[PDB]
Amino acid sequence: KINWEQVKEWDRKYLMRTFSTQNEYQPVPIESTEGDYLITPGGTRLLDFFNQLCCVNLGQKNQKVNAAIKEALDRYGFVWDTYATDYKAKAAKIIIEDILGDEDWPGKVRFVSTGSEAVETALNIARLYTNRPLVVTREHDYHGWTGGAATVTRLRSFRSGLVGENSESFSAQIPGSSAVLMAPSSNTFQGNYLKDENGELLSVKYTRRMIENYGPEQVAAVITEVSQGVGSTMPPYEYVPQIRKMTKELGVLWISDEVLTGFGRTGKWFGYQHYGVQPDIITMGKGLSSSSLPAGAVVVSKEIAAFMDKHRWESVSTYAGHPVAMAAVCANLEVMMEENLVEQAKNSGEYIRSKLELLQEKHKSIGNFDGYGLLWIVDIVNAKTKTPYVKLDRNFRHGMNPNQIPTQIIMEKALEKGVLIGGAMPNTMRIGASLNVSRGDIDKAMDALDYALDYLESGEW
Amino acid sequence: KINWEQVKEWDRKYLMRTFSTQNEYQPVPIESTEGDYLITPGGTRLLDFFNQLCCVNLGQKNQKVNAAIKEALDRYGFVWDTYATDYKAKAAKIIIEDILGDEDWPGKVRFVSTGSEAVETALNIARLYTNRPLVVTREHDYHGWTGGAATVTRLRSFRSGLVGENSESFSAQIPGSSAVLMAPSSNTFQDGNYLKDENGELLSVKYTRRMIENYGPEQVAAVITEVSQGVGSTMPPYEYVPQIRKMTKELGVLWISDEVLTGFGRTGKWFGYQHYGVQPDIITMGKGLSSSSLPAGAVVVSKEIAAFMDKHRWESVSTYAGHPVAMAAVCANLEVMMEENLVEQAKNSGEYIRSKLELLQEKHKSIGNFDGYGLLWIVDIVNAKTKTPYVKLDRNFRHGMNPNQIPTQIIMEKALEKGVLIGGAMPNTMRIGASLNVSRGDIDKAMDALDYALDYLESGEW
Amino acid sequence: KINWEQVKEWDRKYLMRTFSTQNEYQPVPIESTEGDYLITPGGTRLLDFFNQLCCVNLGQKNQKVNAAIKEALDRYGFVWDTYATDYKAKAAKIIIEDILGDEDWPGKVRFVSTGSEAVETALNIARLYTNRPLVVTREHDYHGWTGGAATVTRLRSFRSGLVGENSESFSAQIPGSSAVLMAPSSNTFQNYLKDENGELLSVKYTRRMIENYGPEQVAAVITEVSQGVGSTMPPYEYVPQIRKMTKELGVLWISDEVLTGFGRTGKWFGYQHYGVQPDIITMGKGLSSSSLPAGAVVVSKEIAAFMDKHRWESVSTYAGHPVAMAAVCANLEVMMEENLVEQAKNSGEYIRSKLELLQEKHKSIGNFDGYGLLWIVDIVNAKTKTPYVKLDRNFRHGMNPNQIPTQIIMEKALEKGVLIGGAMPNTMRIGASLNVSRGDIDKAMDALDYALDYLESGEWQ
Amino acid sequence: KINWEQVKEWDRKYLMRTFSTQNEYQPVPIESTEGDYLITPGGTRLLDFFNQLCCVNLGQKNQKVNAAIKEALDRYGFVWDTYATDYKAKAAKIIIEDILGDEDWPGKVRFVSTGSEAVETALNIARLYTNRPLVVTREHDYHGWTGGAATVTRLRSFRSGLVGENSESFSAQIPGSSAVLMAPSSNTFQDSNGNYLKDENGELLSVKYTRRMIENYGPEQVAAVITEVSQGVGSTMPPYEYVPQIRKMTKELGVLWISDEVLTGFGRTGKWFGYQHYGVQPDIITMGKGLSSSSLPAGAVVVSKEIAAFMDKHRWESVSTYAGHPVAMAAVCANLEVMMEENLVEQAKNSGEYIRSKLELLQEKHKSIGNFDGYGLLWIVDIVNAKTKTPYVKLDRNFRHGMNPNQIPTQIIMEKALEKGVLIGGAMPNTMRIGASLNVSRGDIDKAMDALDYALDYLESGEW
Numbered sequence A: 001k002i003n004w005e006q007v008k009e010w011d012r013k014y015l016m017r018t019f020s021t022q023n024e025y026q027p028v029p030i031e032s033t034e035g036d037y038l039i040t041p042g043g044t045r046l047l048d049f050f051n052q053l054c055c056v057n058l059g060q061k062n063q064k065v066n067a068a069i070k071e072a073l074d075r076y077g078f079v080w081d082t083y084a085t086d087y088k089a090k091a092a093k094i095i096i097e098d099i100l101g102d103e104d105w106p107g108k109v110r111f112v113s114t115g116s117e118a119v120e121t122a123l124n125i126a127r128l129y130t131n132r133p134l135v136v137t138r139e140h141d142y143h144g145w146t147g148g149a150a151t152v153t154r155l156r157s158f159r160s161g162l163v164g165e166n167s168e169s170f171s172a173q174i175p176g177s178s179a180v181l182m183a184p185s186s187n188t189f190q191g192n193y194l195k196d197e198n199g200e201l202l203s204v205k206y207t208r209r210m211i212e213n214y215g216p217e218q219v220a221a222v223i224t225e226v227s228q229g230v231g232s233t234m235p236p237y238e239y240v241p242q243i244r245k246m247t248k249e250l251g252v253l254w255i256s257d258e259v260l261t262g263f264g265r266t267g268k269w270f271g272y273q274h275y276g277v278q279p280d281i282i283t284m285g286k287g288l289s290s291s292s293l294p295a296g297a298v299v300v301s302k303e304i305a306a307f308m309d310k311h312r313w314e315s316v317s318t319y320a321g322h323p324v325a326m327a328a329v330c331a332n333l334e335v336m337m338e339e340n341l342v343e344q345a346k347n348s349g350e351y352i353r354s355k356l357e358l359l360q361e362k363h364k365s366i367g368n369f370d371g372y373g374l375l376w377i378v379d380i381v382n383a384k385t386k387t388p389y390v391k392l393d394r395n396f397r398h399g400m401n402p403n404q405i406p407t408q409i410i411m412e413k414a415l416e417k418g419v420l421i422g423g424a425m426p427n428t429m430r431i432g433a434s435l436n437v438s439r440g441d442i443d444k445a446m447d448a449l450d451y452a453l454d455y456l457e458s459g460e461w
Numbered sequence B: 001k002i003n004w005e006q007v008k009e010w011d012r013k014y015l016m017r018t019f020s021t022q023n024e025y026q027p028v029p030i031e032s033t034e035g036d037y038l039i040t041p042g043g044t045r046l047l048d049f050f051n052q053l054c055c056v057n058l059g060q061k062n063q064k065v066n067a068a069i070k071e072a073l074d075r076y077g078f079v080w081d082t083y084a085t086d087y088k089a090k091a092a093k094i095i096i097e098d099i100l101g102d103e104d105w106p107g108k109v110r111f112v113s114t115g116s117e118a119v120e121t122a123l124n125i126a127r128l129y130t131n132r133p134l135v136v137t138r139e140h141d142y143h144g145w146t147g148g149a150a151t152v153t154r155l156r157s158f159r160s161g162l163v164g165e166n167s168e169s170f171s172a173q174i175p176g177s178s179a180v181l182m183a184p185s186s187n188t189f190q191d192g193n194y195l196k197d198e199n200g201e202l203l204s205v206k207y208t209r210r211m212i213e214n215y216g217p218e219q220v221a222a223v224i225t226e227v228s229q230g231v232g233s234t235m236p237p238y239e240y241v242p243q244i245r246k247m248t249k250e251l252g253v254l255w256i257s258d259e260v261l262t263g264f265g266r267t268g269k270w271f272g273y274q275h276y277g278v279q280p281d282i283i284t285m286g287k288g289l290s291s292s293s294l295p296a297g298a299v300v301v302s303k304e305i306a307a308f309m310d311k312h313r314w315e316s317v318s319t320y321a322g323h324p325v326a327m328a329a330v331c332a333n334l335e336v337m338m339e340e341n342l343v344e345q346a347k348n349s350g351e352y353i354r355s356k357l358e359l360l361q362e363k364h365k366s367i368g369n370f371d372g373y374g375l376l377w378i379v380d381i382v383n384a385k386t387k388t389p390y391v392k393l394d395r396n397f398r399h400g401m402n403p404n405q406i407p408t409q410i411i412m413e414k415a416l417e418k419g420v421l422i423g424g425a426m427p428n429t430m431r432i433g434a435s436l437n438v439s440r441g442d443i444d445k446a447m448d449a450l451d452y453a454l455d456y457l458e459s460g461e462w
Numbered sequence C: 001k002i003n004w005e006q007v008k009e010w011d012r013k014y015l016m017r018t019f020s021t022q023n024e025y026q027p028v029p030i031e032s033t034e035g036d037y038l039i040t041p042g043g044t045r046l047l048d049f050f051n052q053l054c055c056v057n058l059g060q061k062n063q064k065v066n067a068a069i070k071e072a073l074d075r076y077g078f079v080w081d082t083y084a085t086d087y088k089a090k091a092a093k094i095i096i097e098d099i100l101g102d103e104d105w106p107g108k109v110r111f112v113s114t115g116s117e118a119v120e121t122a123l124n125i126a127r128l129y130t131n132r133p134l135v136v137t138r139e140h141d142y143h144g145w146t147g148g149a150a151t152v153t154r155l156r157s158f159r160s161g162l163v164g165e166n167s168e169s170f171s172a173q174i175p176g177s178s179a180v181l182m183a184p185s186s187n188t189f190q191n192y193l194k195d196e197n198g199e200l201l202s203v204k205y206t207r208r209m210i211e212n213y214g215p216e217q218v219a220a221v222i223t224e225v226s227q228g229v230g231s232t233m234p235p236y237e238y239v240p241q242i243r244k245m246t247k248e249l250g251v252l253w254i255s256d257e258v259l260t261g262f263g264r265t266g267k268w269f270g271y272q273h274y275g276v277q278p279d280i281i282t283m284g285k286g287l288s289s290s291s292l293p294a295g296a297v298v299v300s301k302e303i304a305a306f307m308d309k310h311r312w313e314s315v316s317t318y319a320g321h322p323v324a325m326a327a328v329c330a331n332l333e334v335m336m337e338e339n340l341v342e343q344a345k346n347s348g349e350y351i352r353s354k355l356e357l358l359q360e361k362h363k364s365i366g367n368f369d370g371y372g373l374l375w376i377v378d379i380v381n382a383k384t385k386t387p388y389v390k391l392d393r394n395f396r397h398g399m400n401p402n403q404i405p406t407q408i409i410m411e412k413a414l415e416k417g418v419l420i421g422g423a424m425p426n427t428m429r430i431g432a433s434l435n436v437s438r439g440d441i442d443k444a445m446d447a448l449d450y451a452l453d454y455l456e457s458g459e460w461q
Numbered sequence D: 001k002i003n004w005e006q007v008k009e010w011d012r013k014y015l016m017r018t019f020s021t022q023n024e025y026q027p028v029p030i031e032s033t034e035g036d037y038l039i040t041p042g043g044t045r046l047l048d049f050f051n052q053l054c055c056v057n058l059g060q061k062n063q064k065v066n067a068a069i070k071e072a073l074d075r076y077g078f079v080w081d082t083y084a085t086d087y088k089a090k091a092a093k094i095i096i097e098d099i100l101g102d103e104d105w106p107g108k109v110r111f112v113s114t115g116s117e118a119v120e121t122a123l124n125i126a127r128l129y130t131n132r133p134l135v136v137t138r139e140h141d142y143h144g145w146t147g148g149a150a151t152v153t154r155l156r157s158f159r160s161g162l163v164g165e166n167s168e169s170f171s172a173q174i175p176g177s178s179a180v181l182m183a184p185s186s187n188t189f190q191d192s193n194g195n196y197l198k199d200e201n202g203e204l205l206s207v208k209y210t211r212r213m214i215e216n217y218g219p220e221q222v223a224a225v226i227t228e229v230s231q232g233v234g235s236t237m238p239p240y241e242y243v244p245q246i247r248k249m250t251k252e253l254g255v256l257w258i259s260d261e262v263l264t265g266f267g268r269t270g271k272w273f274g275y276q277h278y279g280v281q282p283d284i285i286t287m288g289k290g291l292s293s294s295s296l297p298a299g300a301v302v303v304s305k306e307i308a309a310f311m312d313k314h315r316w317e318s319v320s321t322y323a324g325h326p327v328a329m330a331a332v333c334a335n336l337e338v339m340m341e342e343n344l345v346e347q348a349k350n351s352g353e354y355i356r357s358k359l360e361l362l363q364e365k366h367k368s369i370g371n372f373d374g375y376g377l378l379w380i381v382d383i384v385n386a387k388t389k390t391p392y393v394k395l396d397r398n399f400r401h402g403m404n405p406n407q408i409p410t411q412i413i414m415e416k417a418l419e420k421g422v423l424i425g426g427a428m429p430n431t432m433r434i435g436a437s438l439n440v441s442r443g444d445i446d447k448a449m450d451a452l453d454y455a456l457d458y459l460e461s462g463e464w
């Protein structure tokens, strides 16, 4: 028996706000979830085409995963990373032996609790292995929020600072803010992508020049997102291979941050696998457990594992390897494999492409779309001017009025159809569902977006 | 039907080592746990007087906590922090209204997933609230391992660097290591009484004051402390904690009490700071927050700090922050703590442990000093002849040393013969803890095993 | 009587080496100088077409400057900046009223002892005035060697680190070597590509970087109008485009005129070729023509009015040194009265015509550009049409000088009694006094012709 | 014929202010100098017992130095460091072979143009030699104003920030302002009687804590400790044992010691260098000020034989345009030769002893003199309220310049002493920093001390 009015009162009074001022905040309670739906206390069913934060890959509240979690709870309990469990060892084995079994670069795994912790771990490993201080990142990359992970995050809207309520006058970034260099993203220098007289993209060419300017001996790693998640982009095809090749030639590591693109999200097990290359280190979260319980991970190459194995590593994280979280990881990955959700993701993405083609034929406010599996971006433009409504685009901050932001207006309208859809960036949709989402829910969501776009293209906002 | 030989094989092969080289590593599989016990696949029962990392406050595998997690799983699922749930709101209400209800400084709570995430959050909030860059920490403090939390960690043995196997030749800290000042710990400037100036002030505090004055108070956001150093294994002189509270107030600087370890009954109060009649501006939480049932951390901020943050849109997202199933575990953990009155149980067992340690010190000249409260104890170990620590670098040691040279390692190995896990992180100092509800029989059994280990240490046969 | 053999022994034994190891070092004593010549103890006259470090603008040992220094020494002595002198006030007046009299942005001057100190001062003022921490520099910029000036220096061959003797094995940068961002130099992205909103890709990306961090985080962009040590010339539109972009984003522009200032480029300052005005200028070299150590910063009226409202807690013992100020006064008065700016402009036109003839004759000249008495000549392999030294401006000094084209050219030209070459391996940096005679220009150019014949013969390989 | 009014107008309008707002600023012109005197345009003679910034060691406008500068100007001109000259090589030989000839440790010299550049150079060298990033400094150290030298300066009143005019309102430090650790001053940890606290083996607690600090970060992270043997701008003298205890601590930890001798060097303390009072030898010395007695801008670093041998094995990729400037080097040579031939080190030592006697007599007469100490021509005098025995300005060495000068005892003293045509005072609010030329006459010491006596009569009346 739940008093949801009291829940709302406690939520307003006792919880720190994010993205909303206390003044403007309206709690949105969710009582339960199932599949691709969120259920409100009043029983409203909301189709979630955010998939929360593109992180509930298996679907909400999967009975096999929950059954597995309950089973672990007959035995545990808690032990820290110094102790071995069946669940922890099995999860590592599934990742190296079963999912990555076709590639021979992967060596070992470290489990932590979050994607930010995974990136922190990867940054530490890369710097220790090379004995070099600098890490290269890209414009608009999001790699997490904790101190180290934030240093490689280049989105001024997502760096844990403060903005005003529909005002430009009360903004601040955190005082004090690094061993980090910002390179151009894949989406710079366009309008197609410019290459030199060698076919090398100008973003990569300049990335190479930056490393050489500092000296390769000063640079541990380039950390990337194969597709920018929060920053909401897709790369030209040759970018990922060219970065892999450039790093190899300069003797610098490449960390593929797969926290979002990992575990079937893009229609392969990992984002990088679309590109015929292999990373030195992968960071993991989100689909690692499909958010059933908090888990993150890093996978390091055999070379890197062999180096770390020769040393005593002075690093403790209390909940790293948590055996109940590991049981949840095991079950999540087993279901993913047995149901062949990767191939299902691939097929559903192809279906989504067709739906978006029709939406673009119909709606001139769709400037561009791209993606794969259950990860899509849709660039929104003024249908008249052919330019984005919000000039600062991906360099915006949240001090703007939401009623001026296209992705906000699309979200509010789509909501009238009982659909959750939109994006983090002001001019770009970021669309994701569970890997096992049904065609009918795809149709429902696309129809809702259709309805929102009519409204956007109508003015009246 | 679990093949534990194959589990050990996968564990060696596929998991990154910490503290042990692959060469020297032997997996120690634990098949299940209960109360104060770990159970091996063979069925051996191990009395855990580390309480893992002093973080299973309620006891292992509490039936009511586990039943509550099972219930949550009927409904969830996962929503991120933008969505409200009963479990998340209730957990915040329990902390603010029930546990801290008698104090009026607390305003609001932010939940995250780990103690390190909680410290990161507190550092961000302190700097934003004050609009100032610098944070003061102390020598030997441990506040976590992630970037920002690590900058305020002043233990060179726990900064996620590398050392060799029984060698000084393969030592490295992470390249690139800044907005932090290290002040003396409370355990500095002695006779063996703590030195004070002509007013009340401890020299550790007076110098901390001079340090902040040297940079300028307008540059300094906060002092972050542990009321009792956890990994660093110390206890303060009584006046330290009130004197730091008063100093920070006088300078217009915040105080963050990092209660990740000392929180939720560990010290025989709800919070460590509560022994000292003061209140902080911000508290960081983990460990006993959920008693390790599921991953959770949190920050509590004062009413003034909440009011300021409330006026702004805060551009911070953590995917698993507020995870509804973790919040369910937190609610159940806290309600069992309250209803069983585990805080009082911890206070009483602490008084009991004190008397057991007095008897052990009488028996053992290798016990130089011991101190603590509730289920958090330090025991400083000395060479019984020379009366000096065996390991000279003490709390400034690193793990390159041979464990056969380390008193707390020797003690741990020997105690293990009695089926008891007990020892410490520091080379010369035990860090002892159990569940808040640890029985007297288990205390006696742990203390007997320590007695036994100390005979061996003192025999010099090692 | 000077025992020059004893001087060499003392020089070997007691002075720290730079650029040469003790093992390879051979002292090069200079007994006196005059005009464009250096005179050895033996009486050999060497024509100096490096003009030392493009810093003896007025010419060596000007009789009027030396006579003015001698007069000042009848009165001083030394007073620090708190005390006023005629020489310090007059040097400030000459700069603001006389030299920059035709421009209305200049406000006040601060005198220091060197160009690095001038840059440190400008960085301090920029960050204080804007209350912002970040400063933007460019790839291959040189702005000095002291801590702050070094942070904006982006040449890995000039950051006060160490390299081996003809070896790659003993190289290090200073440990620790920071509120600075590196943008592309003007010589990136080529013939230069444009946004066709008109914007050079170098400027476009610089803009993006500032927007990505947030313009409210960025105090200034510091540039060289022509990269000195780094040895380049910009596309014509670059300097006006950077001025326009910084103004639009509310960011300061510091023109580092330590090298290009005081007639070097055939105008009083390099920026004056481009119809723009900076917010802050930094000065050294031609400020006194190296007669005595002096540097300076000039800040705009707005900046001066802000600084004037505060008590500035900055002391430099020798800043404003009355005798160095007497030297600056005499140096600037001679420059003005002899019309050396116009003379430099006319000699540069002459040099251009000499270089066109050498390029027509020497396929190892891939390219040249410059103005006044500041010229770059890019050298290439006449056969492949590409540079001999692949790392180019990202090299370090560990390589063998017998592999370096500008070292080859220098050794060869010395056989003609001419000092000429460059800091960069593939690029000449040529400078003489503003009053260098046509005869001496012909003599240097003839030595260069001779040197390129040798380079093109490939005998040194 | 100089128009001094026009000079003062150009000065007001076209020069950036330091320490004074434009609103409050009044130019103080000096037409010429001689010995220990500054001469105003009107012909007022001011006895300068600041010796500018304790940096005109030989005296103002020395005839032999000026003649040597004029001789150099018959030949030069300018050559950068890549070229050898007689003046540069001779200056290095004088330092290593003549001045420091009785010590075995010194190897080589690098000349630069300022003390801040010398400190920048020492920090670079210590970090390169050890291959470690951290340098340790102390509370209230002043090591210069440029980016690297500023990181090891721990006086918030001298870090090139901004404060308001007679207000706490409008203050700022430079945005963005680390591979530096701050250790306690030698002047920390005193008991009630003002005695320095030590452990039972006599080790000062300031040193004991410094060692703990280094051990906490790890000695393998720490390149160097940089010190001032006597804090200059920060205006202190150390407990006697501090300097040897730091030398011994650094040696035991494998860490370098940089003695920043920019102020204490070249006879200032009645020895060639401040460290020489203490029976120790540093790894690196930084020099400025008395190096040329400010005749022209010059700075230098001296490195040990072992550091020089390491540096000699590499190509060092570092250029400073004016480093080694031959005319500046000719001034250094003449400055050092005069110092040696006149035996100015001994003169300074004996004059310090005379000064001590005058200060003892002043302290009997004036209860506002809480303490004094020093040596040679470098003295501190701590000023207290004669009635409370407590400093007037509570923040003391951690003050900033936003304070009203009419509340600052060292400002009140300077203003009063000026009535007697003596310049005397200090940078810190409760502490005089007194210096004159090494060859200052007894009569001038008497004149300065009589002005101080006068000023303290006024301070002690409380009328201000």
Ligand SMILES: *Cc1c(COP(=O)(O)O)cnc(C)c1O
Pocket: A053, A114, A115, A116, A117, A119, A142, A143, A144, A145, A225, A229, A230, A257, A258, A259, A260, A261, A285, A286, B317, B318, B319, B320
């Ligand atoms: C969401 C995200 C992270 C951080 O994960 P958390 O679990 O939110 O801390 C890191 N990297 C990428 C690419 C992400 O999308």
Ligand SMILES: *Cc1c(COP(=O)(O)O)cnc(C)c1O
Pocket: A316, A317, A318, A319, B114, B115, B116, B117, B119, B142, B143, B144, B145, B226, B230, B231, B258, B259, B260, B261, B262, B286, B287
């Ligand atoms: C263990 C600990 C932390 C870090 O918590 P984690 O959950 O391990 O990230 C922070 N502070 C203190 C005092 C701790 O004991």
Ligand SMILES: *Cc1c(COP(=O)(O)O)cnc(C)c1O
Pocket: C053, C114, C115, C116, C117, C119, C142, C143, C144, C145, C224, C228, C229, C256, C257, C258, C259, C284, C285, D319, D320, D321, D322
């Ligand atoms: C030479 C130079 C400097 C530094 O001047 P120094 O007098 O060597 O300290 C600064 N900026 C530029 C552009 C330079 O060429």
Ligand SMILES: *Cc1c(COP(=O)(O)O)cnc(C)c1O
Pocket: C315, C316, C317, C318, D114, D115, D116, D117, D119, D142, D143, D144, D145, D228, D232, D233, D260, D261, D262, D263, D264, D288, D289
């Ligand atoms: C004055 C001083 C400096 C800085 O020298 P400048 O010539 O002013 O740059 C450095 N160290 C000490 C001890 C000083 O007194």
Ligand SMILES: [Cl-]
Pocket: A138, A185, A186, A187, A225, A226, A227, A228, A233, A234, A235
């Ligand atoms: Cl990309």
Ligand SMILES: [Cl-]
Pocket: B185, B186, B187, B226, B227, B228, B229, B234, B235, B236, B240
């Ligand atoms: Cl403490």
Ligand SMILES: [Cl-]
Pocket: C138, C185, C186, C187, C224, C225, C226, C227, C232, C233, C234
């Ligand atoms: Cl350029």
Ligand SMILES: [Cl-]
Pocket: D185, D186, D187, D228, D229, D230, D231, D237, D238, D242
């Ligand atoms: Cl001292």
